[PDB]
Symmetry: C3
Subunit: 450 residues, 3 copies
C-alpha cells in the first residue's frame, strides 16, 4: 500500500549555540533534515509532512525547493502533538512512517524492513540494542510482540538489564494514527504528549506491535549538539569512503577523505590524503588526485593527474590533462584534452584548447585560448578601468612571451608570436610577431653597497 512520512523538525537546538534551528546544521554539506527528506523520498513516500517551528523563516529559505507539506507547530507540546498536526492529511489506508529531522543517518534499507514487518492495524517499532541503556525506555517482548515500553524509573531489577531500547521511529496506518493520537494524554513528569504511548494504546486495542532492530546503532542516533554532530559526520564519511573503496576507488586514507555531494567514477582512480569532493563530481578512468585537492562541481576526463594543493570549481577537464600543483580553476574553466596548467596559475571563465600550456604565475580570465598555445610565465589578462569585463581571444599555435599583459578586448590570431614584457592592446594578425623595443640606460662601474 501507499506510504507517507512525517518528519519532526521543530526544535530550537539550544545546545548548538547557533542562530539556526536544530535540523539545518549540515552533515556532509547538507542540512540534517535534507538527508531525512531524501531518504523518505527514495523510500517511495507520496507525501512528506515537515513539522517545523523554531527558525521557521530560515527553514523556509534554506529548504524552499523541497517537496514537503509545511506543517507549522506553534508550540512543542510533545512528539504526539507534533505528529497530530499532520494527521488530518493522513490517508486512512496509507502507511505512515515517523522520522526525526535531527537523526539523518537512518537508512532506506532499515526503514523498508520496518515497514514490511508492520502487522495489519498494528505498529512496527524501530528498536536498538545499547550496551548502556540507562535513561531509555526498555522494550518488553512477550512472544514476538512489544507489550510495553518501560521507562528508566519504572523498571524493576531484571528489566534494567534489557538492552533493547525504544528509538521513537515507527510505522502505522493513517487511520490507526488518527485514532490513537486523539487518545494520548500528558499525565507525566514532563507534561508532554509522547508518541511512545501509542504502543500502550495499540495493546489496549488488542493490536499487534512488532519490534524491528536497527542493524547499526549510529543509524538512529540524533545530534543535540555539535560534538554529537561531528561524530555523525565522521560515521557518514567513513561509510561513504568504504563504499567507494569496495567499488574500486583507491583512497590512501579513508579517515582523511571527505565527500559532500555525489561522486561518479571510473576504474583505477587514486585519491591521495586530505581531498575534499563537493557537489556533483565525475572522474574518469585512471584519474589521480594528489594530496590537499578540493574539487567542487567538476568533470575530469580519463588519465588526468591533478597534483597537490589544486582547487577546482565548476570546471571541465579533458582527458590526459595535467593540473597542479597549486593550480586554481574558477567557475567556467574548460580545459581540453592534453592541456597543462601549472603552479600559481588562476583560470577563470575561459576555454583552453588541446595541447596548450599555462605553467606558471599566470591569470587567464574571460578568455578563449586555442590549441597548442604556449602561455608564458607572468602573463595576465586584464581590463581597462571602467565597466564590464571584456574578452581576450587567442587563436591556435600562439606563443605569448612571459610577463605579457593582454588588455581585453583584444584578439590574437593563429600562429602569432608575442615577445616577453609586451603590452597588447591592439589586435595581432595571423603570423604576426610583436616584440617590445626597450630603451635601457647602461652605467659602467656602478659599485653596490659592499
Amino acid at each position: 500500500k501507499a506510504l507517507s512520512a512525517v518528519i519532526l523538525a521543530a526544535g530550537k537546538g539550544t545546545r548548538m549555540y547557533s542562530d539556526l534551528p536544530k535540523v539545518l546544521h549540515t552533515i556532509a554539506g547538507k542540512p540534517m533534515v535534507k538527508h531525512v527528506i531524501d531518504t523518505a523520498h527514495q523510500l517511495g513516500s507520496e507525501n512528506i509532512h515537515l513539522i517545523y517551528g523554531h527558525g521557521g523563516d530560515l527553514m523556509r529559505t534554506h529548504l524552499a525547493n523541497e517537496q514537503v507539506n509545511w506543517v507549522l507547530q506553534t508550540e512543542q507540546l510533545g512528539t504526539a502533538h507534533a505528529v497530530q498536526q499532520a494527521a488530518p492529511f493522513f490517508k486512512d489506508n496509507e502507511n505512515i512512517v515517523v522520522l526525526y529531522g535531527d537523526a539523518p543517518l537512518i537508512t532506506k534499507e532499515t526503514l523498508e524492513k520496518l515497514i514490511e514487518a508492520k502487522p495489519e492495524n498494528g505498529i512496527a517499532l524501530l528498536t536498538v540494542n545499547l550496551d548502556n541503556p540507562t535513561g531509555y525506555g526498555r522494550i518488553i517482548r512477550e512472544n514476538g510482540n512489544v507489550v510495553a515500553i518501560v521507562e528508566q524509573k519504572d523498571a524493576n531489577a531484571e528489566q534494567l538489564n534489557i538492552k533493547e531500547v525504544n528509538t521513537g521511529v515507527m510505522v502505522s496506518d493513517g487511520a490507526s494514527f488518527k485514532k490513537w493520537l486523539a487518545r494520548v494524554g500528558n499525565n507525566n513528569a514532563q507534561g508532554e504528549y509522547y508518541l511512545t504511548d501509542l504502543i500502550a494504546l495499540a495493546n489496549q486495542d488488542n493490536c499487534q506491535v512488532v519490534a524491528v532492530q536497527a542493524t547499526d546503532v549510529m543509524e538512529v542516533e540524533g545530534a543535540n549538539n555539535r560534538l554529537q554532530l561531528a561524530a555523525l559526520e565522521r560515521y557518514f564519511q567513513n561509510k561513504q569512503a568504504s563504499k567507494l573503496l569496495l567499488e574500486g576507488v583507491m583512497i590512501y586514507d579513508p579517515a582523511r577523505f571527505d565527500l559532500r555531494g555525489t561522486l561518479e567514477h571510473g576504474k583505477d582512480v587514486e585519491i591521495d590524503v586530505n581531498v575534499i569532493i563537493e557537489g556533483n563530481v565525475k572522474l574518469g578512468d585512471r584519474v589521480k588526485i594528489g594530496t590537499g585537492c578540493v574539487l567542487k562541481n567538476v568533470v575530469i576526463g580519463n588519465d588526468v593527474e591533478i597534483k597537490p594543493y589544486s582547487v577546482l570549481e565548476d570546471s571541465i577537464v579533458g582527458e590526459k590533462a595535467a593540473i597542479g600543483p597549486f593550480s586554481r580553476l574558477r567557475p567556467g574553466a574548460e580545459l581540453a584534452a592534453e592541456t597543462h596548467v601549472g603552479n600559481f596559475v588562476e583560470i577563470k571563465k575561459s576555454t583552453v584548447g588541446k595541447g596548450s600550456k599555462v605553467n606558471h604565475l599566470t591569470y587567464v580570465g574571460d578568455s578563449e585560448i586555442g590549441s597548442n598555445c604556449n602561455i608564458g610565465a607572468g602573463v595576465i589578462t586584464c581590463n581597462y578601468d571602467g565597466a564590464n569585463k571584456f574578452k581576450t581571444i587567442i587563436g591556435d599555435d600562439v606563443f605569448v612571451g612571459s610577463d605579457t599583459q593582454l588588455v581585453a578586448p583584444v584578439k590574437v590570431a593563429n600562429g602569432a608570436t608575442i615577445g616577453a614584457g609586451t603590452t597588447i592592446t591592439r589586435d595581432v594578425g595571423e603570423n604576426e610577431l610583436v616584440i617590445t623595443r626597450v630603451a635601457q640606460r647602461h652605467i659602467q662601474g656602478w659599485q653596490r653597497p659592499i
Copy 2:
C-alpha cells in the same frame, strides 16, 4: 590555607634522543613543564618550586619569564631528594602539592579534589585505576585510608589483582613534608630516596593518608619518549576540540584540528578540516575557515570567509572581508572591512582600506592602501637597491593596472589611475592618469616552427 607547588623537572629524557631536557618538549606548542606551571598557578599556588638539573641553561633561556623558584638539583638521587631541595622554602602551615614536569595533562579540577581531601597533618594521594597495573605500586585501603603501597615484587596473589595504583602526586602540609623527608632512606634495589615512602612514614606517625582517584587516566600520564608524547598531544587536542564543539564551534573533524594557544570565538563559526590555530586568535560571529588554513596571532571580524590554504600571522581582518584561497598575510597586515585578498597574494606590514581588492599574484609590503582601491594582478611594491625598506602610500579610489611596479618611497593620491605595465617612481597626483607609452616592432609573415 595557603598553597605552594613543587614541580620535578630535572630529568635528562634520554629516550627522547634530543639535545633538550625532558620537560621542554612541547605539547600544543608549549613546553610540557609550562603546562604544569600554569596549572599550579591557576590552582592558587603562592610559590612554585621548580626542581631542575639537566639542560639547566636551556631551561633558563626557555622559561626565563616564569614566576618560579629555581631549585637546581645537582644529582638525581630520587623523588624524595628532589622535593627535599625545595623543603627549606616550605611554610609550615601551607599545603604543598608535588607535580611532575613530564605529566602535563593533570587538571586544576582533579588537583582541587585532591587538596580538599587532605586530612589535617595527613596526606592526600592521587591514585589511578589501570586495567593492567603490572609494575606499579598497589594501593592498599583499610577502611577509607591508604595503609600501604605494595610494589610489584612484594604483592601476594590477591594484591596483584588490585587495579588502583600510585601516581606519585600528593599533598601535605609543609611541616609534615620537612619532618618525613628527613626520614626517607634509600635501602632498596635502586638505591634511591623515593617520595613514595612518605605514605609508610605517615602511617608510622598515626597520620591519615586518603586516596583520591583521578577521573581520567591520561591526566596523570607522563611521557618518557616521543611516542608517548604524541599520544598526550592527541588526547589534549581532542579535549580542546570537544570543548569548542560543546561551546558551539562547528569543527568538521575534531581529529583534524589543532589549537596551539587560545581561541576566542563568536557564534556559528565553521572550521574545516586540517586547520591550525596558533598563539592568541580571536574569531567573530559567522567566521568560516576553509581547509588547510594556518592562523597565528590574528583577529578576524564577523562574517569573514578565509578560503583554503591561507596562512595568516600577526594580522587583523575586518568584518565581511574575504581572504584566499592561497593568500598570505605576514605580520602587520591590517585589512579593513569588506576587503578582498585573493590567490597567490602576499601582504606584509601594510594597511588595506575598506572595499579594496588585491586579487592575484601580487606582493604588497610596507604600504598604506586606502578605501575602494583596485590593485591589479601582478602588482609589486619594491625598493631601490640600497638600505632600509621605504613606504608606498596609495590614497582612496585608486586603480593600479596589472603588472605595475610601485617603487618606494612613493605616493599615489586619491582618484589616480595607473595603466598596466607601468613603473611608478614619482608621486602621482590627485586624479592623475599615468599610462606607459610602449614602443613595439611588428613583423608580418613570421612563421613559427610548425
Copy 3:
C-alpha cells in the same frame, strides 16, 4: 642451511575492480608483492620463485628489475599446484618458505622464528589467534605438534572454540616439498590442490609439524579488495611512524604522517601534521617541516625550516636555508647554505648560491645563481620561441629588480644591478647598472567612474 622462497602472486584480484593484477596494488608507494620480495631477500633467500599469471605483462613491466625466478602458472588449480610449479627448482637440502604476494606486512623477524622452529624433515606452520575464527581451519595441537587442521564444516563443538588458525605460510625442506606436493589431491568441495594438505601428509609420514604463532595479526593479513588494502596501509604507516617517534623524530600526529620510501634523520627533527615523505629522503639535525609539505627524493641539511605547503622533488637544500611557505622545488633544484626561497616561487634545474634570496612570485629555471644575490619579486627566466631551453648565468652579489625578465641564454656578471621592469637579452658586465628608460603619458584631471 640455505633458504629460498616461493611467492604466490598469480591472482586476478577481481574485487579490486582494476586493470592491474592483485599483487601490484601499492602499499606506501610500493607494489604489495615488492614488499614480500624485499622481505624474502633480507631473510637471506638465495632464490625467490615468483608464481605469476594474471596481468603477466604488467607484472613483467612493473617488476622488471626484481631478482626473481619468473614462474608462469597458466591455471590457478590451487596453492599446492602453484608451489609445485617452482618445485623442480628447489634444492633438496635447502629450506623453502611459502609466502603470499597479497600479504605484504609479514616481517623478517616472524619468519626467522618460523624457520628456526622447523624440525628436521618436518614443517613449521605459521598460525594466528583470531577472536572470531569462523571460516578458518583450526589448529589441533597434540603435545607440541600440529596433527590436524580442521576446517569450519568438520569441526565439532569444542574445536569450533579454538582460536588458533592456519595462515598457509610454512617452511619445509625442498626434498620434503617435492615428495608431499606430488601426493596432494583435489578431492574436496572446491576441486583444488590445497597446500594445507601438506600437514596431513607430513603426519602420515610420521614427520613433525610445529606451530609458530605470529605476534601481530595484521602481519599475516591479506587484501582482497581496496578497503582491506587501506587498513593494511594505515597499519603500516602507524608502525613506520611509531618507529620514527621512538628514534626521536617529533611527529605532531602520527595518524597524519605518510612515509613512502625511506627516511634518514638526525636529532630534534620536527614534522608537522599532513606531511608526505617519498622516495629516499635525508633530513639533518633540527630540520623543521611545516604542515602540508611533500618531500620526494630530497636531501635537507641541518637547521633548515620548510614552512607550510611546500613541494620539493629531486632537490638538495644546504644548512640553515629557509623554504616556504608555498614554495616549489622541481628536480635539479640545488640550494646552498643560508638561502631563502619564499611564497609562490618555482625553482627548476637551477643552482642558487649561499645567502641568496628568491622570496616572491618568481620562476627560475635552468639557471646558475651565485652567492648573496637578491632576486626580486616577479622575476622570470624565459626562452625565445624556438627549440631547446637555454641557461641563465647570474654571478655573485647581483641585484635583480622586481619583474625583470631574464631571456636565456644570457650572463649577468658579479656585482651587477638590474632595475625593476627590465628585459635582459644581452650579457651584463661586472658592476654594470642597467635601468629601463620608461616613457609615460601623464594626464591631469582624469576623473574615474565615481
